[PDB]
RNA sequence: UUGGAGAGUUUGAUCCUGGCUCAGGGUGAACGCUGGCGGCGUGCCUAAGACAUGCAAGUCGUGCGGGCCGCGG
């Protein structure tokens, strides 16, 4: 239910009523996009690094 | 004087500080896998929520008067 009251001329008027509705369909119509997500990149380099460090020191002690 | 053990864990390494973690005993327990026997214990820590049926409190004729029936005539 739509009402396009502001014109003193009718069929400018309508000319808005109608389009409101239009437009307004368009909107509802089309909704949001693909694609997710991204994976990691750099995993291999990066936490590797941390598991080369870790190990090596590792066989140490004591605290 | 019948009683007192610690380890892992920050650093390239070190010492200190300091948290986290584990091995110990316990239980009115539960859960998983398994399950032969006995004894002594023990078993609604939740809803002091709600409950079918039976049973948990009576007895005395040597306190008193009755009624129902068994017997003596
Ligand atoms: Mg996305
Ligand atoms: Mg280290
Ligand atoms: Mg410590
Ligand atoms: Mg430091
Ligand atoms: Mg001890
Ligand atoms: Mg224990
Ligand atoms: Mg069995
Ligand atoms: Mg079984
Ligand atoms: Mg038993
Ligand atoms: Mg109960
Ligand atoms: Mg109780
Ligand atoms: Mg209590
Ligand atoms: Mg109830
Ligand atoms: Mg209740
Ligand atoms: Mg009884
Ligand atoms: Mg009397
Ligand atoms: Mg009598």
Redesign the pocket.
């Given at each position: 239910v739509i009402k396009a009251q502001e014109y003193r001329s009718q069929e400018l008027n309508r000319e808005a009523a109608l389009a409101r509705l239009v437009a307004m369909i368009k909107e509802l119509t089309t909704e949001k996009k693909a694609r997710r997500p991204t994976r990691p990149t750099r995993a291999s380099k990066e936490r590797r690094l941390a598991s080369k460090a870790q190990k090596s020191?590792?066989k140490?002690?004591?605290?």
């Open positions: 020191s590792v140490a002690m004591r605290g």
